[PDB]
Amino acid sequence: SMEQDIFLWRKETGFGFRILGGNEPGEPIYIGHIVPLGAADTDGRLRSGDELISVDGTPVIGKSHQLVVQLMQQAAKQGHVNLTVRQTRL
């Protein structure tokens, strides 16, 4: 894999992706379910299984999903997000 930045404008339906892991610090955080026809799906770049490493410049590596909860709460509020993910070369 390799690190990629993915900026998404929020839609009325949201960003359209779920998260897995980071249940405790040190447990890796991954992109889970991507909502069909949602913002992430339509953009096309984000994939389930991509490892999340930062949100809007804030590193989430080794951190709790609770930090991501906070970061995505703000991402909702501002109506956009910039995700750094490790992605599979296709």
Domain that holds residue 65: 1-90
- Count of the separate structural domains present in the chain: 1
Resolution in A: 2.0
Q: Would you call 67 exposed, middle or buried from its count of C-beta atoms within 10 A (0-12, 13-18, 19+)?
A: middle
Distance CA 23, CA 15 (A): 21
CATH number for the domain that contains residue 51 = 2.30.42.10
Long-range (24+ apart) CB contacts under 8 A made by 33-40 are: 38/11, 38/13, 38/14, 39/8, 39/9, 39/10, 39/11, 39/13, 39/14, 39/15, 40/8, 40/15, 40/16
Distance between CA atoms of 52 and 68, rounded to whole angstroms?
Answer: 9
Q: How far apart are CA 59 and CA 77, in angstroms?
A: 19
Q: What does the block give as tokens for 13?
A: 């339906």
Secondary structure E strands in the chain: 2-9, 17-21, 29-34, 51-55, 58-59, 80-87
